[PDB]
Design a protein around this ligand. Structure first.
Ligand SMILES: [Mg+2]
Ligand SMILES: [Mg+2]
Ligand SMILES: [Mg+2]
Ligand SMILES: [Mg+2]
Lengths: 95, 79, 79, 95
């Protein structure tokens, strides 16, 4: 019921980590499609996180913030691109 | 690294609040299309937030979580 | 095993149609609660069906897929 | 647009395989909770699949149909039960 500002922040951070989980398992969900649809993507998330750290006095590169959001160097992730969609796996890769 | 657990929490929470704000301004983006593309929507966000509070020992209703994500009662947003 | 690819297709399709039928009769179960519990709902089913048709070379609209899953126009079900 | 009965069946089977994927990745989603909520679970799916095979003249045990739905012997799956929820992983297993 009655929650502290430290609880609100803990719940925001944790829900953010749930989102990150989720975008990592929906590796098929393209950033451009996210961009086109929703005006953000995993890159906007990395940038906003960078902005937050820089405002807190923590210097951080584009690629450091991306490793945080992606869970691996962004290069390791986007070269793990080339792969069938969930609906194409289901259609052709099973029976 | 040199970034403590509590710095991460700060940055993760700020980024979440910025997402929330950005979804409030992109009110033209339908939960349905977010769901069909990405497998989550504003209702999933409210659900994950509620589940986070529960996981931390704080019970919370479906409507409380939605108030938080939407920045208003859900039914007022539904308009 | 002794069960061919085409037997599987038969059985998988029949089980899907039985699920569909069972969700039509459990119209008291809200898409929202299905979504918050299981991470899918009747709208995800319609979306997956549309994506299956697309994956097979057949374009299909959001409303066509929903007609199939709901057994009626979505808006008529929304009532 | 205009689709054959063989296409309808192919799309039903494939959407069923997408569901099965999904329930396998949401291994945290309990059958009882599914039962309580929705009047079905992964066991009802196994049973219906069994009924369909038996009607097609294919004998199949309770446990064979379950291996089909679960993707592994049901024993290997339910002993891989005891594990933190997604929200508890996010809360306590990260920073
Ligand atoms: Mg972006
Ligand atoms: Mg959702
Ligand atoms: Mg859904
Ligand atoms: Mg059941």
């Amino acid at each position: 019921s009655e929650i502290s500002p430290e609880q609100r922040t803990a719940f925001e951070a944790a829900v953010f980590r749930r989102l990150l989980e989720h975008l990592r398992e929906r590796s098929d969900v393209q950033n451009i499609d996210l961009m086109n649809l929703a005006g953000f993507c995993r890159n906007c998330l990395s940038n906003w996180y960078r902005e937050a750290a820089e405002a807190s006095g923590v210097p951080m590169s584009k690629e450091e913030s991306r490793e945080i959001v992606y869970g691996m160097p962004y290069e390791e992730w986007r070269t793990q691109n080339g792969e069938a969609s969930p609906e194409q796996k289901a259609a052709f890769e099973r029976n």
